[PDB]
Design an enzyme around this catalytic site. Structure first.
Site, PDB file in Angstrom:
ATOM      1  N   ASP A  25     108.834  96.677  82.757  1.00 47.52           N
ATOM      2  CA  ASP A  25     107.863  97.663  82.267  1.00 47.52           C
ATOM      3  C   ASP A  25     106.696  96.968  81.580  1.00 47.52           C
ATOM      4  OD1 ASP A  25     106.492  99.769  81.183  1.00 47.52           O
ATOM      5  OD2 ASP A  25     108.224 100.673  80.179  1.00 47.52           O
ATOM      6  N   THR A  26     105.626  96.699  82.332  1.00 45.58           N
ATOM      7  CA  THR A  26     104.490  95.994  81.751  1.00 45.58           C
ATOM      8  C   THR A  26     103.753  96.834  80.710  1.00 45.58           C
ATOM      9  OG1 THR A  26     103.048  96.684  83.576  1.00 45.58           O
ATOM     10  CG2 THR A  26     104.208  94.569  83.808  1.00 45.58           C
ATOM     11  N   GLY A  27     103.978  98.143  80.680  1.00 44.45           N
ATOM     12  CA  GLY A  27     103.379  99.018  79.700  1.00 44.45           C
ATOM     13  C   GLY A  27     104.122  99.119  78.387  1.00 44.45           C
TER      14      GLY A  27
END
Ligand SMILES: CCOP(=O)(COc1ccc(C[C@H](NC(=O)O[C@H]2CO[C@H]3OCC[C@H]32)[C@H](O)CN(C[C@@H](C)CC)S(=O)(=O)c2ccc(CO)cc2)cc1)OCC
Lengths: 99, 99
Positions: A25-27
């Site tokens: 999850d890059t967010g």
């Protein structure tokens, strides 16, 4: 590996000796896992998402193996809808975005 | 390009004739943008994450330019705390995770 995004980027992780599935999850700034038992001390923390804040248990310097790559960092445990691997650990395994 | 994850993966986007900053988010199935009065029809939707759910307006076949790469798909508009580019658009610009 190279992971495309046509499906959720779910991978197997090993934490506390147990296998689980988690979302790259890059967010997410931080790694948040669903309720589980982890050994050692922890301190309460708050984290906010799209729908508000939740109470989590912060475990520091936790060994976690993500898709065969080792990491040692902070792991938050609480009522998250999904196990998410955040940038604090994605950086440790050398993960980048590319297009 | 290649984007490391030391910091939030923020990039410039162009949507509805306006420039904005948004997060390239492999953990978001769909794209969610801050309140903006886009033209055309829409449908109500509820999307959930850490903290619960929020109410958004779903617009379909919306053009977004992400780092000069064009993409057309569903955009959810509502009181989101952050502009998030989800997998529905990230796939169209050829974005992958690599480690
Ligand atoms: C002023 C700042 O606002 P803020 O602090 C919160 O800001 C943020 C809110 C959300 C994000 C993005 C999300 N990251 C996140 O939850 O990260 C947490 C843990 O790590 C911390 O780092 C940043 C926050 C903390 C995630 O990537 C994507 N989500 C889904 C995953 C959870 C998988 C279920 S989703 O957004 O829910 C979502 C659901 C459904 C759709 C439609 O398909 C689209 C998007 C980043 C910053 O307000 C406090 C109330």
């Amino acid at each position: 590996p190279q992971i495309t995004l046509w499906k959720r980027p779910l991978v197997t992780i090993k934490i506390g000796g147990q296998l689980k599935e988690a979302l790259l999850d890059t967010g997410a700034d931080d790694t948040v896992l669903e309720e589980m038992n982890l050994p050692g001390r922890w301190k309460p923390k708050m984290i906010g998402g799209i729908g508000g804040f939740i109470k989590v248990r912060q475990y520091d310097q936790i060994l976690i193996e993500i898709c065969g790559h080792k990491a040692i960092g902070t792991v938050l445990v609480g009522p998250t809808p999904v196990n998410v691997i955040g940038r604090n650990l994605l950086t440790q395994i050398g993960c980048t975005l590319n297009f």
